[PDB]
From a paper:
Here, we identify an evolutionarily conserved hexapeptide sequence as the major aggregation-prone region (APR) of gastrointestinal peptides of the glucagon family: xFxxWL.
Interaction networks formed in crystals of polymorphs A and C are essentially identical. Aromatic side chains form a cluster in which acetonitrile or ethanol is also present, while TFA forms multiple H-bonds with termini and Trp side chains. As the concentration of EtOH was reduced from 30% to 10% in the crystallization solution (keeping all the other parameters identical), the entire cross-β scaffold rearranged from parallel to antiparallel relative orientation. The two different organic solvent molecules are located approximately at the same place within the crystal, despite their different structures and chemical properties. In polymorphs A and C of APRTc5b, an acetonitrile/ethanol solvent molecule is incorporated in the aromatic cluster, leading to somewhat larger ring-to-ring distances as compared to those of APRex-4.
Numbering used by the authors:
A (entry chain B), B (entry chain A): 1 to 6
The structure:
Amino acid sequence: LYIQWL
Amino acid sequence: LYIQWL
């Protein structure tokens, strides 16, 4: 699982 | 920007 809010 | 990989 990978989540990124950049 | 938003990246999501379940």
